[PDB]
Amino acid sequence: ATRHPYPFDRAVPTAIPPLYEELRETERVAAITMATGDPGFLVTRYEDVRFVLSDPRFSVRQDLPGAPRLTEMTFESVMTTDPPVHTRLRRLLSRDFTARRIERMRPRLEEIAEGLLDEMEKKGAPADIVESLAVPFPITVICELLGVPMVDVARFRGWADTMVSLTGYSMEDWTAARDALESYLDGLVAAKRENPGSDLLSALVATAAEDNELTDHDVRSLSLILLLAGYEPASNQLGSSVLTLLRFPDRLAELRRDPGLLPSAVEELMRYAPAGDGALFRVTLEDVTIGDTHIPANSAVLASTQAANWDPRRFDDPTGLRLDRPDNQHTALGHGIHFCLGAALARVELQVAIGALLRRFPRLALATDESGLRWSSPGSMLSGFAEIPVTW
Numbered sequence: 001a002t003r004h005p006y007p008f009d010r011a012v013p014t015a016i017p018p019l020y021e022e023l024r025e026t027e028r029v030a031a032i033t034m035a036t037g038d039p040g041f042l043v044t045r046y047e048d049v050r051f052v053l054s055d056p057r058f059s060v061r062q063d064l065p066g067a068p069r070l071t072e073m074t075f076e077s078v079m080t081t082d083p084p085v086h087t088r089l090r091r092l093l094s095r096d097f098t099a100r101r102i103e104r105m106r107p108r109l110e111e112i113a114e115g116l117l118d119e120m121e122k123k124g125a126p127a128d129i130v131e132s133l134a135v136p137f138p139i140t141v142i143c144e145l146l147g148v149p150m151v152d153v154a155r156f157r158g159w160a161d162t163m164v165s166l167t168g169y170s171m172e173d174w175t176a177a178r179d180a181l182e183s184y185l186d187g188l189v190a191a192k193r194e195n196p197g198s199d200l201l202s203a204l205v206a207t208a209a210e211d212n213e214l215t216d217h218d219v220r221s222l223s224l225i226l227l228l229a230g231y232e233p234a235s236n237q238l239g240s241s242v243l244t245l246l247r248f249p250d251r252l253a254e255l256r257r258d259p260g261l262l263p264s265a266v267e268e269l270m271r272y273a274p275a276g277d278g279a280l281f282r283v284t285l286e287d288v289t290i291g292d293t294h295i296p297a298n299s300a301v302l303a304s305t306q307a308a309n310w311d312p313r314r315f316d317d318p319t320g321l322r323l324d325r326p327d328n329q330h331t332a333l334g335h336g337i338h339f340c341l342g343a344a345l346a347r348v349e350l351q352v353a354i355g356a357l358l359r360r361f362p363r364l365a366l367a368t369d370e371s372g373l374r375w376s377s378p379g380s381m382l383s384g385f386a387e388i389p390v391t392w
């Protein structure tokens with residue numbers, strides 16, 4: 001079997017990279033060469049993707065000695081570790097992120113989304129869904145939640161867009177963004193201790209004051225990951241989901257005439273449209289066998305949620321769009337102990353923004369032809385479209 005260059009490319013910007021599907025149909029565990037040159041393995045089938053993401057012999061750590069590297073661009077993510085430390089940090093954050101807790105945020109989220117739609121109507125059609133909605137909505141939600149002041153949202157956006165671009169920026173430019181953001185965050189931690197607010201970063205800081213094993217540096221790392229993860233995938237997801245509905249107008253119509261379909265339609269939209277083309281990264285802590293493939297300890301094993309969510313072994317007519325698809329346990333939010341901390345938040349965000357968008361614009365339509373669309377970051381873990389021009 002050949003060794004394939006990773007990451008993979010899209011042919012047509014609206015469909016996931018075809019090599020994912022080719023491998024999924026032909027090779028249970030594929031051989032790859034990552035962007036650093038190091039060799040890795042790749043699973044694409046639904047059951048294998050779940051397995052790799054959940055099994056305790058697979059580490060999320062990217063700092064294991066002698067282990068192959070996905071990238072050379074790294075940042076310290078205290079939460080991106082294995083247990084028992086991971087479990088402690090999870091226990092630290094997870095109460096604030098249940099469905100019940102997030103549900104309290106729904107009315108505020110409605111206000112934010114309604115305002116952004118108001119702005120859209122004020123500049124008139126056509127509008128770019130990305131800049132008008134997909135970016136400001138989750139970036140505002142996550143900044144308010146964590147306690148970042150509105151006046152620093154633009155700078156944060158710059159740093160964040162830089163850090164999640166695993167390609168297209170040099171070491172120096174990338175590292176500058178990383179250091180700028182961390183430094184900003186140490187400053188914010190400071191300010192939050194100095195003058196507490198009703199936000200989450202305050203509570204974290206207060207907690208750290210009383211716990212000498214929970215450093216300000218830890219809180220900084222947590223806030224960093226919460227900002228990146230809280231803004232980027234959601235931003236990509238909201239736009240691609242909107243685009244997807246516009247590409248399936250009968251489904252769009254169905255959804256506008258029955259808002260009860262909104263929660264399940266959001267799950268399907270995450271299954272159909274990935275927030276990026278990067279496969280999730282693991283490293284083996286011991287020897288593991290998957291089928292005929294014997295994977296030695298300290299090997300890189302990548303798991304494609306994109307391929308898995310289109311796996312016809314698990315989903316009927318996977319290239320189709322079913323708003324109330326039964327048994328829709330897609331992998332877009334991960335699986336196991338690292339399952340997305342912001343699952344409920346992402347769900348509510350998507351439901352609110354899409355529902356509002358649809359209420360406002362009963363004749364919403366793509367202002368362009370699909371052939372005009374472009375895929376923004378082919379070499380990065382996360383990616384959306386350059387623009388999504390709409391009219392109403």
Ligand code: HEM
Nearest residue numbers: 229230233234237275280332333334338340341342345346
């Ligand atoms: C407000 C929105 C979000 C927040 C606050 C958030 C936060 C986080 C955090 C902190 C983690 C690390 C969890 C851990 O290691 O224990 C995580 C994991 C993850 N998130 Fe989210 N996230 C958000 C939205 C999204 C969206 C929209 C997607 C995809 C469409 C997504 C996909 C994932 C996946 C796949 C993982 C697992 C990573 C892995 O298994 O290696 N997240 N999220």
